[PDB]
């Protein structure tokens, strides 16, 4: 066996390579790369030994069964889908949340998680929005950007980090802010907050909520 080699045909456009068949034929040196033509486990027992079937026939059969589906292609699971991000959402961009209890608040975009959801912070001390996931379709990307290129976001802050844990009821069960989250909030905030205060009137801008008022029309105004 040999180590995999990166494709020698760069992509020109999706589905079309840069090089033709004969061009690739030479690049791959195919002129010299020519080539020519358990179900049971035995166990001892206290007979002497028994041949044991690893998988047993069903003990039941429903009266009816559905047939097998026809085969398709291109229907991937969610985890294998490509994630897209609006070009207007770069790290350090200020976004306006449009849904949930934090609607109208202006928050700082940190990064896009593997699931495709965005990660944002208020920061908490400015508008009481913590490290929280938000969906890009439900945010307005303003044109205001702070430079958070030097901010080290903890690497454990992943989709699994922010996934909700189920709470059971038989009265009521209350969510609790784990001490780890508080520690993570301070670590990230301590780096973003000084950079927000570098821009005049920006911390006050982040404290203030977005709302439409008389005569103000979203299609007319720049964000």
């Amino acid at each position: 066996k040999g180590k995999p080699h990166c494709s020698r045909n760069p992509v020109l456009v999706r589905g079309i390579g840069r090089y033709s068949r004969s061009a690739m034929y030479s690049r791959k040196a195919l002129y010299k790369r020519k080539y020519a033509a358990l179900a049971t486990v035995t166990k001892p027992v206290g007979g002497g030994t028994r041949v044991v079937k690893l998988r047993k026939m069903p003990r039941y059969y429903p009266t009816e069964d559905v047939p097998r589906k026809l085969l398709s292609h291109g229907k991937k699971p969610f985890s294998q889908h490509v994630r897209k991000l609006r070009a207007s959402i770069t790290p350090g961009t200020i976004l306006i949340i449009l849904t949930g209890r934090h609607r109208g608040k202006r928050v700082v975009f940190l990064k896009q998680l593997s699931s495709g959801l965005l990660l944002v912070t208020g920061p908490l001390s400015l508008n009481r929005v913590p490290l929280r996931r938000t969906h890009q379709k439900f945010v307005i990307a303003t044109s205001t950007k702070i430079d958070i290129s030097g901010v080290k976001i903890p690497k454990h802050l992943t989709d699994a980090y922010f996934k909700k844990k189920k709470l059971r009821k038989p009265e009521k069960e209350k969510y609790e802010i784990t001490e780890q989250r508080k520690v993570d909030q301070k670590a990230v905030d301590s780096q973003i907050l000084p950079k927000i205060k570098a821009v005049p009137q920006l911390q006050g801008y982040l404290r203030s909520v977005f709302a439409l008022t008389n005569g103000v029309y979203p299609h007319k105004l720049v964000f």
Binding site: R59, Y60, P62
Partner: protein
């Protein structure tokens, strides 16, 4: 012959039920109660029947012998199986495949046996 006897009874039989846009057959040795040439339990030389035992324990597998085709009293051989669920199905599968006795009724016989045994569990 079976085919000739199916032309007589396919739409004229005391065992024929037509109702609610559905058709069934109530004769013995019909594994699916289906008005069908394949599943009819009277017109073929060889037939398979699965019924519950006289007591609600086990199944009775009925096989039609080859010889007495015109002698209804000795025509059918009954066998009671009262093993565990998986062992009962294996015997039915072997009684059909190994003997090559209507191999086209193998899963219908196995599905009917699983439905009788399941009905013999305690009702929740």
């Amino acid at each position: 012959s079976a085919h000739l006897q199916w032309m007589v009874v396919r739409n004229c039989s005391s065992f024929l039920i037509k109702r609610n846009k559905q058709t069934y057959s109530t004769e013995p040795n019909n594994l699916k109660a289906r008005n069908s040439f394949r599943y009819n339990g009277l017109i073929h030389r060889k037939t398979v029947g699965v019924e519950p035992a006289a007591d609600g324990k086990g199944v009775v597998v009925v096989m039609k012998r080859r010889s007495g085709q015109r002698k209804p009293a000795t025509s059918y051989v009954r066998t009671t199986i009262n093993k565990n669920a998986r062992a009962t199905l294996s015997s039915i599968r072997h009684m059909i495949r190994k003997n090559k006795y209507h191999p086209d009724l193998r899963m219908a016989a196995i599905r009917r046996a699983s439905a009788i045994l399941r009905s013999q569990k305690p009702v929740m």
